[PDB]
Amino acid sequence: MKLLLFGYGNVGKAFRKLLHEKRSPELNDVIIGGIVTRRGIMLQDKEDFTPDLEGDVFKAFEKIKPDIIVDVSSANYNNGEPSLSLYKEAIKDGVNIITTNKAPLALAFNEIFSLARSKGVKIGFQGTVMSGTPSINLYRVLPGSRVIKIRGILNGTTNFILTLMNKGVSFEEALKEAQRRGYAEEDPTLDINGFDAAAKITILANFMIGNSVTIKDVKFEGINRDPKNEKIKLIAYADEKEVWVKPLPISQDPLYNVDGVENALEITTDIQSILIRGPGAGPVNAAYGALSDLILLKRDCL
Amino acid sequence: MKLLLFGYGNVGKAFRKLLHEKRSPELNDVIIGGIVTRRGIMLQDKEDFTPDLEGDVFKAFEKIKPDIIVDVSSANYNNGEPSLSLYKEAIKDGVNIITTNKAPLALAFNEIFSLARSKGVKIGFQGTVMSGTPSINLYRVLPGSRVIKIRGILNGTTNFILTLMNKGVSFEEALKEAQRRGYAEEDPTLDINGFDAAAKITILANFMIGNSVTIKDVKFEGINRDPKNEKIKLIAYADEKEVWVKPLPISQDPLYNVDGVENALEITTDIQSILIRGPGAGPVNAAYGALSDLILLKRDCL
Numbered sequence A, B: 001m002k003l004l005l006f007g008y009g010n011v012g013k014a015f016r017k018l019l020h021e022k023r024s025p026e027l028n029d030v031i032i033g034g035i036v037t038r039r040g041i042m043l044q045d046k047e048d049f050t051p052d053l054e055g056d057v058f059k060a061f062e063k064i065k066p067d068i069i070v071d072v073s074s075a076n077y078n079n080g081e082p083s084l085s086l087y088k089e090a091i092k093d094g095v096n097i098i099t100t101n102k103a104p105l106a107l108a109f110n111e112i113f114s115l116a117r118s119k120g121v122k123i124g125f126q127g128t129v130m131s132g133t134p135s136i137n138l139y140r141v142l143p144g145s146r147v148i149k150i151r152g153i154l155n156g157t158t159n160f161i162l163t164l165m166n167k168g169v170s171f172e173e174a175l176k177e178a179q180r181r182g183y184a185e186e187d188p189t190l191d192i193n194g195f196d197a198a199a200k201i202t203i204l205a206n207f208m209i210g211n212s213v214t215i216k217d218v219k220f221e222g223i224n225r226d227p228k229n230e231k232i233k234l235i236a237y238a239d240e241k242e243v244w245v246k247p248l249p250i251s252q253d254p255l256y257n258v259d260g261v262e263n264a265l266e267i268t269t270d271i272q273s274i275l276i277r278g279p280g281a282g283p284v285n286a287a288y289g290a291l292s293d294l295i296l297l298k299r300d301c302l
């Protein structure tokens, strides 16, 4: 089983590390055929990236001819490219996809999944929501559950910022520490303006609720520079009717002690209501989400 | 695929109902070959139980010759019988097991699972811990996770009792309402003396941590008749060293607002710490745990 690793930022690097450390006994026939960044194409599995040739991800795809693409490249919410057209080509060629990049799915979920379904192609996408805390994969172990509504804190970066700000840390310093820890999107405004949280609730609305929705039609906003009296959280919500993201005051609520980089998800089904909580961001966490998807794919359980 | 339903109390009945209601599209070739209670053996799938013959579960097993046994019979913590010897016979004959009954696993986990592993037999046991709230199956979507420690509220009945008692309800009235709702073990003392919670932490220690442990060596105790000043919870805990159950005062703690029949589980791994919470007991909830295991077995994902 040959992987093409698309992206080698903090998640890509942590994924390669986790694969090597957790190789036995299920992942021995899984090889990284090649790694692609903006810098070019490495046709090796090495810790340090060195291009063997220049070329984009499509050249790398044609060269490596992989069984699976691991998409750990950065978000593009304008048109989802190049990931979007890459997913289309891969599915058409019967190549499986594991992604931590939310952009293609938040824009064209129903199209991507119907394309993959017709081809018998599998898509792992746990890393797109709450990183390594089962969300997508939590739903996989809730078969036959009819999801009525969902609510939660889905952005690690802004939650970490708000938490630090009440420990006497300035906005700019909080953001810089979030970036230092590698919590933030490459474009940190995607966290700040609520684009990232909006992408995640879109994905969840599509997958869990069955509401066919693009990020383009989701009403959302982010956090502020400003406080002190109440506890603010960025709340994402979806039911069969509405999908939104908005900062809100939270009463001394199940989402109240969800602090630092921690995220949480409340799922209401026909059967019951459940809540899961864990780290929402963190390169190792996100990479573990992708690794979980890989092991599950190996087990034929995606 | 032919099921033998062993037990037809509230869980058994809710399981049969859920199977019929969630039949499409994955479960159409799943039939209940027969149902066995203390009253005898019905060789039909009917809502109302009527014996077609007298005989125990072994007679029913020989008569039906099932692909899977669904064990929703009552707990026996003395020796785990008849379920224990039934599991042995079933595994030997290559028959899969789905159980909500904790007793055999809490007594002979390592033996049962090594027997099944050698035979390629699958065991679903989600319903044994936190009913329909992924616990066992949550771990299934955490592959490669090394579980360091676990802590939680694992008994629905006692948690419901404590909650009602602060709404001006007496112990006896709280217990009677727990029984009315069908939360309690057939022997309600199993809830009260902490046997049920102890069974669940034993199962989890075995499956998640890898600590080979029987309930016989777990130090445990239950709730009291007595309060008023603090919030008491029955806390179960396991790490690589110790396994225990004890009532404790809980500070205004992640397990603090876990009230009524709700249960919760804190899992600490090499990667991260996560918490899941949902109803811990409830016939429909437990039966859904078993149904989840059935769908996963159908998908070859147990």
Ligand SMILES: NC(=O)C1=CN([C@@H]2O[C@H](COP(=O)(O)OP(=O)(O)OC[C@H]3O[C@@H](n4cnc5c(N)ncnc54)[C@H](O)[C@@H]3O)[C@@H](O)[C@H]2O)C=C[C@@H]1SC[C@H](N)C(=O)O
Binding pocket: A006, A007, A008, A009, A010, A011, A012, A036, A037, A038, A039, A056, A057, A071, A072, A073, A074, A075, A081, A082, A100, A101, A102, A127, A128, A129, A130, A131, A154, A155, A156, A157, A158, A182, A183, A184, A185, A186, A191, A196, A280, A281, A282, A283, A286
């Ligand atoms: N960083 C994290 O912890 C998380 C990351 N995410 C996603 O994981 C993905 C990767 O993250 P990260 O490692 O930080 O990547 P980073 O953006 O730092 O680097 C992207 C990599 O892709 C390559 N690349 C980008 N565009 C390319 C193009 N057009 N052609 C060729 N190569 C290209 C770059 O060269 C680089 O190697 C992103 O899509 C994230 O959105 C997934 C789980 C989390 S959620 C984080 C969120 N900010 C929050 O606070 O909730």
Ligand SMILES: NC(=O)C1=CN([C@@H]2O[C@H](COP(=O)(O)OP(=O)(O)OC[C@H]3O[C@@H](n4cnc5c(N)ncnc54)[C@H](O)[C@@H]3O)[C@@H](O)[C@H]2O)C=C[C@@H]1SC[C@H](N)C(=O)O
Binding pocket: B006, B007, B008, B009, B010, B011, B012, B036, B037, B038, B039, B056, B057, B071, B072, B073, B074, B075, B081, B082, B100, B101, B102, B127, B128, B129, B130, B131, B154, B155, B156, B157, B158, B182, B183, B184, B185, B186, B191, B196, B280, B281, B282, B283, B286
């Ligand atoms: N009831 C619930 O909501 C839950 C049930 N559990 C387990 O599910 C199992 C069944 O529960 P329930 O429907 O209430 O069963 P119940 O005990 O009411 O009836 C048992 C059935 O098995 C049959 N049976 C028992 N022994 C037999 C024998 N030797 N030969 C032939 N037939 C026999 C009986 O005739 C009867 O039909 C039990 O093992 C429970 O421990 C699983 C999830 C929950 S956890 C509940 C726990 N008390 C708590 O508060 O946390």
